[PDB]
């Protein structure tokens, strides 16, 4: 089988490139961040605009939800992250410490920590409740493109323009693994699989790879899309068929059969790089977002 994602809504409102879209874990909301310095919240099922959250001084690279859908964290060119109470829209904490643009962020599942990655080549771990930096990891020797906790919060994975993925012990900050294949093109994206067994990593050679990170083995390779310049977010789609989903620099959403590596769908409609995609936690719904020449978010729905 193949999915049959079709376009349901186009969300317009950001006035610059849209950098990141994330579904709330409770499935009710979509959050978006933008180069326009704004976070916007949208209804996940009807695409209806809900509110604008503001405070960052420069463009926002990434946004992420707390496990209970009540908080957001954002990562900004202004060198800070901000923790937000979504219902009130207020900035609860500003995390200061990085010496250059912050590109990526995430809560742990417990939601008492935030992990961040930066142009300054560090990964930082922050106390959600104090807003204080708990650890600074000398993670990489080039800018950090993604950071993600595993399902029990004991591990952090990071990816960098230095060509490496690295896995870190949350508690000690120790590096526990460096993944590298037969070459080291910039690693533009990484995340753990939902079950925590694998990581999915994008490299700027038009390639996605599924890794057994314990065994240090590449298990699947996905190609056919265009990805040589931008750090495009990818996903496991697990609500229906088992897919891999990623944006592409030819302005399409690509969907692959996880097991067979075959392209099963390409979603057409955006007019610029599709730099972010997200998969709804319970329904077969995809959100995509595109760069400056497009500025829109699209919601897509599939029967499987």
């Amino acid at each position: 089988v193949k999915p049959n994602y079709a376009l349901k809504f186009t969300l317009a409102g950001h006035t610059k490139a849209v950098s990141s879209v994330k579904f709330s874990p409770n499935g009710e909301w979509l959050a978006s961040s933008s180069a326009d310095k704004l976070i916007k919240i949208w209804g996940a099922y009807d695409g209806k605009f809900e509110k604008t959250i503001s405070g960052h001084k420069l463009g926002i690279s990434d946004v992420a939800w707390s496990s209970d859908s009540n908080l957001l964290v954002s990562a900004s060119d202004d060198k800070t992250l901000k923790i937000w109470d979504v219902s009130s829209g207020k900035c609860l904490k500003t995390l200061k410490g990085h010496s250059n643009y912050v590109f990526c962020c995430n809560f742990n599942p417990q939601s008492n920590l935030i992990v961040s990655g930066s142009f300054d080549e560090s990964v930082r771990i922050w106390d959600v409740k104090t807003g204080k930096c708990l650890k600074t990891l000398p993670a990489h020797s080039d800018p950090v493109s993604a950071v993600h906790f595993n399902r029990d919060g004991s591990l952090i994975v990071s990816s960098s323009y230095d060509g490496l993925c690295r896995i870190w012990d949350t508690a000690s900050g120790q590096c526990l693994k460096t993944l590298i294949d037969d070459d080291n093109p910039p690693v533009s994206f990484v995340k753990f699989s939902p079950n925590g067994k694998y990581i999915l990593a994008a490299t700027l050679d038009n390639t996605l790879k599924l890794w057994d990170y314990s065994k240090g083995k590449c298990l699947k390779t996905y190609t056919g899309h265009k990805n040589e310049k931008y750090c495009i977010f990818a996903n496991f789609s697990v609500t229906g068929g088992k897919w891999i989903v990623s944006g592409s620099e030819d302005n399409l959403v690509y969907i692959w059969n996880l097991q067979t590596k075959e392209i099963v769908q390409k979603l057409q409609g955006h007019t610029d790089v599709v730099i972010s995609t997200a998969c709804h936690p319970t329904e077969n719904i995809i959100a995509s977002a595109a760069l400056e020449n497009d500025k829109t978010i699209k919601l897509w729905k599939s029967d499987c």
């Binding site: 080039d142 323009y161 910039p186 400056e292 020449n293």
Partner: protein, 301 residues
């Protein structure tokens, strides 16, 4: 300025020339590209002769040494931000300058490199690559946003961030007042004046010799006799320059010509004999969104 030749980048769907300089091998031009490559082109045929991987981000600026043996490059964001390349026989890296986003050779004897990191000037030895000097004084700084440190023609003085430095003693000898946000200024090739945005200051007295409004936000280069000055205005707050450049009498700064190529400019340079002007011009219909540059070769009348 009669058009003589035009060419775009070979093999590429969107042409990505960003900067250029004539090589010592006449008829050939070196061009940097938006993917960090250094390419050699026959300027008359448009034929690509060689390609080298210099940086992991777009080349912004380059400078060949006069004897043809060395080349400085600067990139956009990836480290090393600048590098020194050997061109004798094999093309290879001699030294790298990790954080200097702009570099120039010394001018009289080309045995040093001067780099800029924000407000700070670094001077390196070409042979060892060692940092010989750091020039910075926070009390004297002007904090020019596009500061570029530069040697004077005899290499005994440095202009950095609008501050004049004596190199031998590593002492600031004069701070010029700040009258713009971006341009930190250059030495005139006569060694006796500095051109700091619209202000021409006398180095004998520090008096204001000229007000030249047309030089606002301009980068400049002189012909090799020192009699003509080319100037092009940065695009304010995308292509580095606008679509026009201007020539000036180098003695009295009176304008000579205004040339509007109707395309935004990325770079320009002249050959040692001042027969030719090479200009990187963007055909892109929305400036640098859809960057699509060509190199035009003009005859200097």
């Amino acid at each position: 300025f009669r058009p003589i030749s035009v060419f775009r980048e070979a093999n590429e769907d969107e042409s990505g020339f960003t900067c250029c300089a004539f090589s010592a091998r006449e008829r050939f031009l070196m061009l940097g590209t938006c993917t960090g490559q250094l390419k050699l082109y026959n300027v008359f045929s448009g034929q690509e002769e060689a390609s080298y991987n210099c940086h992991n981000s777009a080349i912004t600026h380059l400078e060949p040494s006069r004897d043809g043996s060395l080349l400085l490059t600067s990139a956009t964001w990836s480290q090393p931000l600048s590098a020194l390349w050997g061109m004798k026989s094999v093309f290879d890296m001699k030294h790298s300058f990790t954080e200097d986003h702009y570099v120039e050779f010394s001018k009289h004897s080309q045995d040093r490199v001067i780099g800029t990191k924000g407000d700070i000037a670094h001077i390196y030895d070409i042979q060892t690559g060692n940092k010989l000097l750091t020039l910075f004084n926070p009390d004297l700084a002007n904090n020019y946003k596009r500061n570029c440190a530069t040697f004077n023609p005899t290499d005994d003085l440095v202009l950095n961030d609008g501050v004049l430095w004596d190199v031998r003693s590593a002492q600031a000898i004069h701070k010029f007042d700040k009258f713009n946000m971006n341009i930190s200024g250059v030495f005139h090739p006569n060694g006796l004046e500095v051109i700091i945005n619209t202000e021409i200051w006398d180095l004998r007295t520090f008096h204001l010799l000229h007000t030249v409004p047309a030089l606002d936000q301009c980068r400049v280069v002189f012909n090799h006799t020192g009699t003509v000055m080319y100037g092009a205005m940065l695009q304010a707050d995308k292509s580095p320059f606008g679509s026009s450049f201007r020539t000036f009498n180098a003695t009295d700064y009176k304008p000579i010509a205004t040339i509007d190529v109707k395309r935004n400019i990325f770079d320009l340079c002249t050959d040692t004999k001042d027969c030719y002007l090479a200009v990187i011009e963007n055909q892109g219909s929305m400036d640098a969104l859809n960057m699509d540059t060509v190199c035009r070769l003009y005859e200097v009348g």
